[PDB]
Design a protein around this ligand. Structure first.
Ligand SMILES: C[C@H](Sc1nc(N)cc(Cl)n1)c1cc2ccoc2cn1
Lengths: 557, 427
């Protein structure tokens, strides 16, 4: 049929005219097929004969259906879609199974010939005009226009889902207990009723839809879970991902590692512990898709654990609105974080992992906070409320980091949970100068045209070194000079730098970086017992600064 | 509300199209609050559902009045206000009295509900489309557009300007020394009267409003008085600038003086006249940071004279009505926050502070949102425009929590910066 529902008014983008593409010559076979197809559509209202100078035209084709059983009419709307107004998005998101409440019965029904069952705004039909050519373009040709939603048109998905929402409203109101989800052609219907009263209510729905131009399956329902939707396997009782299977082959091409990494990332939302760090490292560097990549030891091991984790099936439970959400985060290898979300201890609703670097220079406390934000945001989308956290960090450690960090930091209600590795700061810069500690006035200059710079220091105890460097930035010499002061230094040391750049990095207590130097400066800082860092303006003849500035700048600087 | 009227025709700034801003995910309780509210506004014809043919979107949120268990709808019209600037800024701009900032008291009254009396040009309604999202994307999500003037759009005060003049007229004529100013949704009323007489004149002004259907209980509905005094009153004439402070210790270590020389050096690119030449004192050579040091005579003078310049209006800086106002906030610790307002870096038009003040809560985001409202409010009083904020926080953490503590009906521009180790130099 053609739903009696009102139509959605539509226009063409501002200051544009309908499409007018020439119809390319078609062979006899393709022509006869198109006629046989259009004629049929013409009998059901889908299309109508036109003619009288409808300047508009869209090219058509016809191709052999699967296995080559029947022809299919292909309408290339590229030109029209461009001249068509923009619409609201059909979906700005996708339900996550874990956010689904537990239901007793669930069946899915697909609307047959969806688009063709919905009228097209009369004032727009004139633009969907196309023509069936006559043999070797001798005579005119048959001309039609659409009366319903065309297959490849820009507005079919939007208008259809919106038409369906209106058609479904009345039924929903009279059935608060029935849950309905629209996904393209499909309509998902669930409830906590009995398979008997459920199928009763189902039929009642088919009828409601039929009174509206929409036909649905009889007992071809395709219902009866498990359902396979968007890579998931939904049961009324639980959920998991489609079955994952790892290749197990001798050599691996880039293409194979990518498919593998994709599968693992997908599995990581219910299967805890999944790691792809070592596997992802191998894809680094522009490599051809067919290139074989030797697996390294780590990779082997990582792939190994993953196979282990995947052997026994795991499922996720559904959401109970009456209980709290508990999220627990564990620290895996450096930078790698994993988490589980449940309501009743260990019956996971969802799983996940966070690794994202987020700028060079960072520390477990900042990463843990970032992981907490991802999870917080995610929870709001899926369940509409934040979870209570369980983190591997002492209330004290957290308290001392938040209170002294320049950035504003909050964190939802949490509790400590002793699950090594625990998170901690690996060193603390002193707030005041260390008395009876050698002071190092470090500095560093560098020639821009040459690149040869000298890094060095001068102490109040008379000591003074100055090593040269090749191919270094003014910034590196400053990071190099601090590195020195820490090396030839005792457990306690006062360092005076004139480099704000260095001050910023070090001052944030980073326990990992991308600069090769910064990682070494971190090792030193850890071995110390007291380190005091202070800053002064460069080139202002400050006491000690100029002293070093001299035997550092001398010779290109 | 008030009778119809030829809808003032509006138009976007050509070369620009309506807003298409994504809706930030909301918590269940806020979503519910919103459908109730929107269901009522619908029954009253304020808004109407719309179809997919409308490609526009402006985000919406829900805040609490003044802890009042009554939710309020907040629409983020920042984008729309930007593509409509021509309209409300030049075409129908509203003047800003310079006297307001000098008043002893300024009471802020919410007059937003008044906008729902007037209808919006039908050809402009499509641009005000917003969307009520749903949990876990389980359903399409209710879409709407306004039929009357919306509350967070700068177009609304502009248009209503005509009515507001008729309404206040009798009150203005009878009280020539009371300053009234309108800034999108709110009315700023100021007088040099004594608190008792002021509060009394505000009551009188509400009676006038009331006759045009503008019941305006202020301070954002006071249903539970914690420290609530009256109806939300500001005291501008007592807003003082925050100077750049120089220590006054009894002992000066090499470190203490090095730090002193640093803050001063920086304070040279701002506050012309500052000098520290006679101050590079004993920091000549290579002494231990510890080693305490005496004090020169030139120094005492240096220090003394510099702090005179600082703690004063940076000679040469003037507000430029055309350029945007920028506000920067630094986290000082212990519930302390410093901020500066300027148009051109380090050329402060104003600096200040904000503290827990024997209250507030251990949430940084909490304090920070409170600081932003305080600063934006002062900015509206003094200049008539809001500043763009450089917030020292993670975009995600902010976007997730700000509405949780927000109470104003406007939203300022904000970008997330990363604070340099300047801090030590408060300003
Ligand atoms: C209407 C049903 S409610 C439902 N509840 C369960 N416990 C299990 C299943 Cl299978 N369905 C539904 C199905 C889907 C599929 C994707 O997103 C959806 C949103 N809602």
């Amino acid at each position: 049929p053609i739903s009696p529902i009102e139509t959605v008014p539509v226009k063409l983008k501002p200051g544009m005219d309908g499409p007018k593409v020439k119809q390319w010559p078609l062979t006899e076979e393709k022509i006869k097929a198109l006629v046989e197809i259009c004629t049929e559509m013409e009998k059901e209202g889908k299309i109508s004969k036109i003619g009288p100078e409808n300047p508009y035209n869209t090219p058509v084709f016809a191709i052999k259906k699967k296995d080559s059983t029947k022809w299919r009419k292909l309408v290339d709307f590229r030109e029209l879609n461009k001249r068509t107004q923009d619409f609201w998005e059909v979906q700005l998101g996708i339900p996550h199974p874990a956010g689904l409440k537990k239901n007793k019965s669930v069946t899915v029904l697909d609307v047959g010939d969806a688009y063709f069952s919905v009228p097209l705004d009369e004032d727009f039909r004139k633009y969907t005009a196309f023509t069936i050519p006559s043999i070797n373009n001798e005579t005119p040709g048959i001309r039609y226009q659409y009366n319903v939603l065309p297959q490849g048109w820009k507005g079919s998905p939007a208008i259809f889902q919106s038409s369906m929402t209106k058609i479904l409203e009345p039924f929903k109101k009279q059935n608060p207990d029935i849950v309905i989800y629209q996904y393209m052609d499909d309509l998902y219907v669930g409830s906590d009723l009995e398979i008997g009263q459920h199928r009763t209510k189902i039929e009642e729905l088919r009828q409601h839809l039929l009174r509206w131009g929409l036909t649905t399956p009889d007992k071809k329902h395709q219902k009866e879970p498990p359902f396979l939707w968007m890579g998931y396997e939904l049961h009324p009782d639980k959920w998991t991902v489609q079955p994952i299977v790892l290749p197990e082959k001798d050599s691996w091409t880039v293409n194979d590692i990518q498919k593998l990494v994709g599968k693992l990332n997908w599995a990581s939302q219910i299967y805890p512990g999944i790691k792809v760090r070592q596997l992802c490292k191998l894809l680094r560097g522009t490599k051809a898709l067919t290139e074989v990549i030797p697996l390294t030891e780590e990779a082997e091991l990582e792939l190994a654990e993953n196979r282990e984790i995947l052997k026994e099936p795991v499922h996720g439970v559904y959401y109970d609105p009456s209980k709290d959400l508990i999220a627990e985060i564990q620290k895996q290898g450096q930078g790698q974080w994993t988490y589980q979300i449940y309501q009743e201890p260990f019956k996971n609703l969802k799983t996940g992992k966070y690794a994202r670097m987020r700028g060079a220079h960072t520390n477990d406390v900042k990463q843990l906070t970032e992981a907490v934000q991802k999870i917080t945001t995610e929870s709001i989308v899926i369940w509409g409320k934040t979870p209570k956290f369980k983190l591997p960090i002492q209330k004290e450690t957290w308290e001392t980091w938040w209170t002294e960090y320049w950035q504003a930091t909050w964190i939802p209600e949490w509790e400590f949970v002793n699950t090594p590795p625990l998170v901690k700061l690996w060193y603390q810069l002193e707030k005041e100068p260390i008395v009876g500690a050698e002071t190092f006035y470090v500095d560093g200059a560098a020639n821009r045209e040459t690149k040869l710079g000298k890094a060095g220091y001068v102490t109040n105890k008379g000591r003074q070194k100055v090593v040269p460097l090749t191919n270094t930035t003014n910034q590196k010499t400053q990071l190099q000079a601090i590195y020195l002061a820490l090396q030839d230094s005792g457990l306690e040391v006062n360092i005076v730098t004139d480099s704000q750049y260095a001050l910023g990095i070090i001052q944030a207590q980073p326990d990992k970086s991308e600069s090769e130097l910064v990682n070494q400066i971190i090792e030193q800082l850890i071995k110390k017992e007291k380190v005091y860092l202070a800053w002064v303006p460069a080139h202002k003849g400050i006491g000690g600064n100029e002293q070093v500035d001299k035997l550092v700048s001398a010779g290109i600087r | 509300p008030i009778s119809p009227i030829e809808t003032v025709p509006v138009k976007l700034k050509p070369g620009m199209d309506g807003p298409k801003v994504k809706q930030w995910p909301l918590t269940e309780e806020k979503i519910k609050a919103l459908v109730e509210i929107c269901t009522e506004m619908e029954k009253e014809g304020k808004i109407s559902k719309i179809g997919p043919e409308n490609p526009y979107n402006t985000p919406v949120f829900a805040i609490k009045k003044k802890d009042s268990t009554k939710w309020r709808k907040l629409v983020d019209f920042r984008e729309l206000n930007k593509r409509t600037q021509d309209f409300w800024e030049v075409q129908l701009g509203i003047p800003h009295p310079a006297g307001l900032k000098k008043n002893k008291s300024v009471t802020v009254l919410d007059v937003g509900d008044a906008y729902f009396s007037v209808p919006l040009d039908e050809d402009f309604r499509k641009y005000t489309a917003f969307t009520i999202p749903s949990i876990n994307n389980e359903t399409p999500g209710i879409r709407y557009q306004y039929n009357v003037l919306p509350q967070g759009w700068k177009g609304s005060p502009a248009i209503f300007q005509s009515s507001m003049t008729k309404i206040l007229e009798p009150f203005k004529k009878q009280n020539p020394d009371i300053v009234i100013y309108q800034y999108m949704d709110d009315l700023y009323v100021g007088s040099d009267l004594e608190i008792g007489q002021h509060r009394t004149k505000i009551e009188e002004l509400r009676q006038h409003l009331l006759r045009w259907g503008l019941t305006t209980p202020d301070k954002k509905h006071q249903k539970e008085p914690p420290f609530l005094w009256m109806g939300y009153e500001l005291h501008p004439d007592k807003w003082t600038v925050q100077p750049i402070v120089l220590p006054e210790k009894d002992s000066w270590t090499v470190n203490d003086i090095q730090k002193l020389v640093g803050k001063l050096n920086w304070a040279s690119q701002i506050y012309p006249g500052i000098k520290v030449r006679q101050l590079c004192k004993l920091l000549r050579g290579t002494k231990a940071l510890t080693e305490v040091i005496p004090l020169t005579e030139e120094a005492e003078l240096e220090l003394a004279e510099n702090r005179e310049i600082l703690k004063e209006p940076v000679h040469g800086v003037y507000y430029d009505p055309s350029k945007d106002l920028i506000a920067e906030i630094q986290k000082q610790g212990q519930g302390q926050w410093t901020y500066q307002i300027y148009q051109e870096p380090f050329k402060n038009l104003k600096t200040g502070k904000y503290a827990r003040m024997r209250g507030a809560h251990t949430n940084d985001v909490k304090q920070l949102t409170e600081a932003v409202q305080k600063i934006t409010t002062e900015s509206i009083v003094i200049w008539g425009k809001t500043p763009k904020f450089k917030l020292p926080i993670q975009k995600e953490t902010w976007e997730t929590w700000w509405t949780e503590y927000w109470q104003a009906t406007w939203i300022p521009e904000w970008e997330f910066v990363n604070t340099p180790p300047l801090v030590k130099l408060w300003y």
